[PDB]
């Protein structure tokens, strides 16, 4: 029916981001208190994220689990 008609859509899409820079990239602590020995732990990175508009890829194909959500137990 719409061979030569125009069509317009208002659409909802998942939010997505890519890492365009890594900023304050590494922060460190020699944690020693209440440890057998000195341990090195990497504290949180800060990321400068960028939206995906020019090129769009579908949501990744995650492997599902067969555990039913909100499952009764007795």
């Amino acid at each position: 029916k719409y061979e030569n008609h125009t069509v317009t859509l208002k659409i909802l899409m998942t939010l997505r981001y890519v890492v365009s820079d890594i900023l304050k990239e590494s922060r460190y602590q020699y944690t020693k208190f209440n440890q057998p020995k000195s341990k090195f732990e990497n504290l949180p990175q800060k990321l400068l994220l960028k939206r995906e508009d020019v090129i769009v890829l579908q949501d990744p194909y995650k492997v599902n689990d067969g555990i039913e959500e909100d499952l009764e137990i007795q």
Binding site: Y61, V63, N64, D65, G66, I67
Partner: protein, 144 residues
């Protein structure tokens, strides 16, 4: 009977076959089918593939690491990849909600217990709680 399915029951047999290195096919819910494999060489770890078709000169499978969960294996159905049948041309799949009528003209719901056929291609279906066979027309596919 039909030889189109041979599901594995025990996870122990699944692990035994994985040790032998044979590929597996693992179904999903409203989602693409998966192939699973054990990596060769020194380091042993699971690998997965989103592709399904047989390997050929024009088609090669892609394998990557993934932390596969035993829950998926134990819960979801599993088959040997080489011996899997793509489709059995029947209206209703196995383990599907269906509706029928009992011997006393009483309507009742059930799931398909077995899928059968004669030599002429006519398909007969057996429901849970019903030993007798049912025609394709006599059944009704219940809407979710």
């Amino acid at each position: 009977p039909i030889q189109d399915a041979k599901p594995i029951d025990d996870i122990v047999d699944i692990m035994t076959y994985l040790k032998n290195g044979k590929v597996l096919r693992v179904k999903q819910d409203n989602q693409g089918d998966i192939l699973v494999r054990m990596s060769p060489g020194k380091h042993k770890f699971t690998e997965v593939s989103r592709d399904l078709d047989k390997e050929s000169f024009y088609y090669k499978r892609h394998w990557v690491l993934y932390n596969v969960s035993v829950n998926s294996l134990i819960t979801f159905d599993v088959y040997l990849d080489e011996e899997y049948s793509e489709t059995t041309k029947v209206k209703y799949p196995k383990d599907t909600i269906v509706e029928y009528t009992r011997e006393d003209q009483e309507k009742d719901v059930a799931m398909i217990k077995e899928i059968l056929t004669d030599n002429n291609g006519n398909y007969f279906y057996a429901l849970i709680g019903e030993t007798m066979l049912f025609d394709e027309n006599k059944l009704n596919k219940v809407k979710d």
